[PDB]
Structure 1
């Protein structure tokens, strides 16, 4: 048994240098998906970056950030967004997730297994290419240049359970993955404790 599945990372603070590198295996070609994470933040900012995907042409491919007391989920472009209202608390484990489907651009947020939002026609029909970079809580520009990254966009807190799916998991899957025994549940695109994750600049794993 997992006996209390607990493996995570370390963010001693938000600096200009600490970062991590994601290294998936299969193409990022995406039209629909699912993804979730258990989080324990310390302090929210004007825009606190948790994770996001980008490309040389579009560094804003995927995105999820917290500003004050709400959640905004962005896809492929700044205009493309999904704001929540009053469902974030500091320093508390929480289940959160959102999804997109190209075929007519559905989007839904889902927290603690509970629907946080519902809305349609975002990134509608768009095709996600593959060839960019994925990082968790950082931007792209600033590698091996002595910082560079905007410290203003960094995050403080704990994270655990990063997993990505090729398809929008049903709402039953949404509620169940929020259960006390969902840590083992690992996605197809990315599996927590399976996909390569190597820290940098002061990141370390914590159990």
Structure 2
């Protein structure tokens, strides 16, 4: 089935390495879940996994890796949920971020386990459509190479609703392949790798 035996490789860090995601449905989100499999080659202070932003706000949605933590941003750089758990370099890891504008509920999951959570994070904010959605780097470039991802990514998915631990664990299970998002679906949604990035 679609997007099953494929990943995207970022060989090195550079000023033009990134990947563009082109969903058919609009990116207007009152609540969402965004998952991705990451195998990091090297991590710096801010290594982007995926990032969504408009011209007025480049940090509408972001998931990145830090030296000792994993950071999930929704609706502005002031809104950071930090999971002090650290990804192992070279090791496939399923990361999900979930968020709901309703009470600012924000959760960060590592391999189907809740690694962090908080409330009142961008409460009442609606993520706007028409922005730029990238993997491995943030928008405008060329780019800042110290932010670029190095390694492998796959199974990038976005649902317009907060999944449950059942559904999240399943997305991180042996059938990760066939579980896709309705906004961004790995294997059907068009993802173009640029600047040296490319499928494997």
TM-score bin, normalised by smaller chain: over 0.9
In 2: Cα distance, 1:137 partner to 1:204 partner: 12
Task: Provide, for residues 68-88 of structure 1, a one-character-per-residue CA deviation record: whole Å limited to 9, x for no partner.
Answer: 021110111111010111332
Q: CA deviation at 1:16?
A: 0.8
SS at match of 2:182: coil
Say yes or no: does 1:158 pair with 2:148: no
Could you tell me whether the CA contact under 8 Å between 2:156 and 2:186 is conserved in 1?
yes
Once the two structures are superposed, residues 150-182 of structure 1 have per-residue CA deviations (whole angstroms, 9 ceiling, x without a partner) of 111111111110111011011111112111122
RMSD: 1.4
| C-alpha contact 2:67 2:86 (8 A) present in aligned 1 | no
SS in 2 for 1:159: strand
Task: Kindly indicate whether the alpha-carbon contact (under 8 Å) linking 1:109 and 1:115 is maintained by their aligned counterparts in 2.
Answer: yes
- Report the TM-score when normalising by structure 1: 0.91
Q: Can you list the C-alpha shifts for 1:24-64, whole angstroms capped at 9, x where unaligned?
A: 11111111111211110011101111110000111111111
Larger mean CA deviation between 47-56 and 170-179 belongs to 170-179
Q: Which ranges in structure 2 are unaligned for 5 or more consecutive residues?
A: none
Distance 2:133 2:42 in 1: 23
2:177 alignment partner, SS class: coil
Greater mean alpha carbon deviation, residues 147-156 or residues 111-120: 147-156
Which residue of structure 2 aligns with residue 86 of structure 1? Answer: 85
| C-alpha separation in 1, matches of 2:197 and 2:77 | 28
Local SS of the residue matching 1:10: strand
CA–CA distance in structure 2, aligned partners of residues 43 and 73 of structure 1 = 19
SS in 1 for 2:80: coil
Q: How many residues are matched?
A: 198
What is the alpha-carbon distance in structure 1 between the residues aligned to residue 6 and residue 103 of structure 2?
A: 37
Tell me if the contact between 1:108 and 1:117 (Cα under 8 Å) persists in the aligned partners: yes
Structure 1 match to 2:25: 26
How much does 1:189 deviate?
0.5
Please report how far the alpha carbon of residue 5 of structure 1 lies from its aligned counterpart in structure 2 after TM superposition: 3.4
- Whether the 8 Å CA contact 2:85–2:115 is kept in 1: the answer is no
CA–CA separation in structure 1 for the residues paired with 2:129 and 2:34? 18
Q: Secondary structure at the match of 1:175?
A: helix
In 2, the alpha carbon distance for the partners of 1:65 and 1:182 equals 21
SS at match of 2:146: helix
* 2:195 aligned partner: 201
